[PDB]
Design a protein around this ligand. Sequence first.
Ligand SMILES: [Zn+2]
Ligand SMILES: [Zn+2]
Ligand SMILES: [Zn+2]
Ligand SMILES: [Zn+2]
Lengths: 261, 216, 446, 355, 145
Amino acid sequence: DELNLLVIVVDANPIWWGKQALKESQFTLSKCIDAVMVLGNSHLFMNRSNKLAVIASHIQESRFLYDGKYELLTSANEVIVEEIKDLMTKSDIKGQHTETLLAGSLAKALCYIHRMNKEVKDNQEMKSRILVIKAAEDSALQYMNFMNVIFAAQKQNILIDACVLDSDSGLLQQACDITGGLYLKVPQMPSLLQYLLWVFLPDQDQRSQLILPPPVHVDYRAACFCHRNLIEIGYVCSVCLSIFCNFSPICTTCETAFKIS
Amino acid sequence: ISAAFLADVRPQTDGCNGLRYNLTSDIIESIFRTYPAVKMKYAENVPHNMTEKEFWTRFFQSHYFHRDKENSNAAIIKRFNHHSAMVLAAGLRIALNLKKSDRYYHGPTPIQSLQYATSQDIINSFQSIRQEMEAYTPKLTQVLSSSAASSTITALSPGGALMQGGTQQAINQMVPNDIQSELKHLYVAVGELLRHFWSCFPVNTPFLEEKVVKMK
Amino acid sequence: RNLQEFLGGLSPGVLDRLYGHPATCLAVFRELPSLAKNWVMRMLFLEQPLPQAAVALWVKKEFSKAQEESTGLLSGLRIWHTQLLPGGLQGLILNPIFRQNLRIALLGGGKAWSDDTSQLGPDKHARDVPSLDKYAEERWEVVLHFMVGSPSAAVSQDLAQLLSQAGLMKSTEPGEPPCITSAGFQFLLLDTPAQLWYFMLQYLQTAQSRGMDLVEILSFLFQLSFSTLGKDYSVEGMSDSLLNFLQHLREFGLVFQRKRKSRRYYPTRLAINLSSGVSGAGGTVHQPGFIVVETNYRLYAYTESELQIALIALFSEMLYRFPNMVVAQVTRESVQQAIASGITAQQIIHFLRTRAHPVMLKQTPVLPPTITDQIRLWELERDRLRFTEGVLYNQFLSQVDFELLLAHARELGVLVFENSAKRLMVVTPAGHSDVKRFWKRQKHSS
Amino acid sequence: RWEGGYERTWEILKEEHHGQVRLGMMRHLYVVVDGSRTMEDQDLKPNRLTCTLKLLEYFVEEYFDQNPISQIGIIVTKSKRAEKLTELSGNPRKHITSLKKAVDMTCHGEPSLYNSLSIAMQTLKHMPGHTSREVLIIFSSLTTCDPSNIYDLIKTLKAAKIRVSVIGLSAEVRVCTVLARETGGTYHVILDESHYKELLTHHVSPPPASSSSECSLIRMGFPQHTIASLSDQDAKPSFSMAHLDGNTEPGLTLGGYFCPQCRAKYCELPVECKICGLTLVSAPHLARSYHHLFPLDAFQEIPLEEYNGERFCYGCQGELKDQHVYVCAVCQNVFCVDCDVFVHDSLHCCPGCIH
Amino acid sequence: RAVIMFGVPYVYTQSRILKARLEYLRDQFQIRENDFLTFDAMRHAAQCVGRAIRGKTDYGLMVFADKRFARGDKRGKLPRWIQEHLTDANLNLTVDEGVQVAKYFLRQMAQPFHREDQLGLSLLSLEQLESEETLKRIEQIAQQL
Ligand SMILES: [Zn+2]
Ligand SMILES: [Zn+2]
Ligand SMILES: [Zn+2]
Ligand SMILES: [Zn+2]
């Protein structure tokens, strides 16, 4: 009855992969896509009850991806190969927006998980996990929506694993900490697939008996809005929850004067 | 105070001829509050005119308790009204509109190193991948190598770079249990003293200064 | 016995030959425990043998038993093997052929198992999936009817001979139909998936009897396991032994085929789940329960096929035969007769639970507990007498001699029963000669 | 005289957000639970006590999930007395344990609302003005015994600006109605277990702040999880201050959370520091209530036949076969019923709006 | 909140003044004495019950503990506005049925209610008066006999 859904989110920023191609490094985006497809094939391979949901997170929007080879696996891969080429051929950069729409893809994934869970037979239980791979820089404005996604996932108890390639993002660290997911940076991108298999592929119950790398320490410092500087103790607004390092009689954000005698 | 202080309270009869009165103060106080007459009789009689148990036996056997014919109906109605009166008498004794929404978009997170790319040549790089993955063929052998697998295992091998730390020392045995309890007690003492110290803070009156000096 | 039980006892050569088929590797992997699957995924691209201690240190100490069970399953199935790692170590490395075929199956590449039917185009006489299921039921119904002996069922001679080798039915009198044995009845009371599984196990144990290659049949079964329901496949490309086996399957109804000359064949859901053995298909939507059990030990059947009528009559007394209904009564005589025929009460209780009417499913117990207990008591009464032939030793003059001979008997393990207080014991007649000779030798030694 | 004739032959025949208004950012909530004889009644299966306490555990879970900066106190009124079942704190585990222990209690006597309200007022007397004073009362029986005038207590609560909301079980009580109306709280009546859950969920959400609500600049600290390694010479195991409060020997933890103001060591967060009174919080805890600041408005409902557009949901890519389609106000996307419900209830954000 | 009338309140017939009044009215207006007694009892009961409501926002419970009220002449002699809401399924119930129906009515009527809900159904605003459909509804509400 173990219905395990493995959600895959891909950092499809064209800028980072274009630069990497300019670097002519050992690892390319095609290798990342192949590794993702292999991981999904193995996930469906482990058990029939296991299901796969793959969504591509591109700057323009989020795309739902899904001869000696398994027929259903062959069809799924050719579908995915069709989807990625379809996106890339139509991938036109029109605008100065560079940050990946990380939050929106997560919201779409959560909605799909909810839809499938409603469709789950009541005789069976659906464990769901989301795997996200990080390549380009993190997004700044999506912080509120990212926190909302984290809160919703923790409410529905969905593990979220973040995989770092080049750029570390403390947001992903905190997300994995709160959600209980696994966070790790892979230095050898070509070896990356094994890190997915050795760590991300096993289920959390399986990971319990298995010996795992220790979790990375995560900080939760706060930046005071008037200068965005990290502090230890700060003054919090009782109205709009704004943080101020210096005592103020009037709040800047909610425009409320502090009634202190 | 409830009206059941007499209806619920019954003479407890045991299995074989036992009057377990169990004269608790709670029922006695309830009766005295509801019926000052019982209090007055107890004060004027117990224990001189009659003993307390004798007074309670009289109360059980008195016609005032066993109230149980127009005169009887009138007496019952008047007693109920008086009881209700005694019970009642004893019962006596902002719209908000934000200004800077962007503060939520970049909250407690400080300014990150969002380094931007160069001139429109980035588009050329964007074209390169757009042309690099336009004609793509799946690959299997190139995905991993034996050397890469060995390096990954070595990183994941216990005691390795990724496998930071490991088993630690049993500090529980290094600290005696008596020393543990004494440390707990000293921690409690220090916590109480520091709570008193910081309770004076913030200092706004000279008295707080002297109290803090005493605490130090 | 499950699938791994037959696989776990095979010789190394058979396993190596079977691993040459990527579908076989896929089935074996899917049959592994989750921990074993994780281990295999770890060892997917490892070209170096892994130290035994290094692998063993990954799992928790508490889950070592599960780890050790997985390790033993991998070793016995020869999925991996130990290699003399340099420096005195004993590395562990997967089978190169098995791992290569598994990677071919998963990553792609290599030759497909068989061509599609697009070469022959759409089927002119294509049938329906419910029709396939009904036909498969009919064929199994035919097999059971023939086992009953009713003239409504006529099968091929070898099929009856196949059961004769299976031991279900013994030909007491030639020319006349063989008389079904007790094990035949026990199988008849088994559920259909278990029936098919045990029949195929018996077939496999006697694969060499027909001169049919053992490896080909198992690999073909694994290929059929992942087949798409409602989809036919090319008969062409298979050995004549495989052709005969497929003809046997068509006679069984596990696979649908229009004619012996047809080049297309449709696997059935029953054949699909055959690889899983008895487990796996926990959500089988079988026929609705037509049997109602009342507190008066009476059974009512909403059926008309002679198969269920015969099944019920095997253990109960028929009272009325309606056109669409059957009224029978559960009696101690009938139940004890069925037990004497070899059927166990648990089989009867399980079978009744299988065909329980949905109305009776409303009750918190599937069956009335009192009836179940009465059935169990009737079963127990049949074997009240414990018959044990043996030799009694009772002439022990000394307690020490009795204790020494008891120690010798427990060493031999031929002791039946002993009494130290009375200094008496019972031994097996076969071991009696050994113990008698030992006793004489001890007197000779004295 | 009905015996004359009787036949049944013919029977044998063929056949809710408010506006952009200030809410209760800081909450001091006290829950009042009746313990009278009426709690043994089986209005809710199996009885009032068990269902009420299970819903109370669920309510505490949701309340701490949505209000990290709130506090919970549990009071049981039994035998005309008031007993503080649980101390005022933010720990969900202790509250759940106390409720589980109270599941097997004895329900007897009568409720004493006066005493329970007096205890709550005394407890919340010293709380700061900016923090909201909220009281929830579960009233099973329709009658209570009060040693003194309750209207004086009502005046005291009004002067102390304490909000009290009551959810009765049988019917409406005039005195409780007046109390809730004057204190600014809301009075409700249980229709069934589902309605009980609905009312509890509604009361989870922060109440709107009245005009009298203060606006003060409170100072808070945000320590990290200071973890010490035994390999380092600077590893000082120390017992947690919260763990010292208990009878069991505190666990000597190598590291943890240390107060930035007085280096007080705590293993649980977010908890205000006991020594200096500083509230030690974390950034997600503050952000956990941000959705209340920007509620998600209800989307426009247009049936599929009336919508001439995409037949795939923007949220789940599911083919739109439902009778109703929910279109956003901002980005005007297409969402099915399930996605619309989940977004409004939990996600509180529109995917296209993020885009 | 709850008014319970224990039986039909028939006047003690021994009053010869009552007897004389009944005889005179029968001899001067052909009025049955029993009919007058039943009408007086029902009028007294309705007076005892009619004071439990102060308006639309006021809800109260009416209980009649007597099987005699099931008589059509006795039942039919109730005020129209009260007898109209007397559902026939509630005629001659038991204690348990009455208690359960009272609980259901209380829970239904204990739900919070708004004066805005009354608009157009039982209450009229300034603009609702000008609607001629509302005027027709008002004319249909009251009847002359
Ligand atoms: Zn503010
Ligand atoms: Zn402190
Ligand atoms: Zn949807
Ligand atoms: Zn939107």
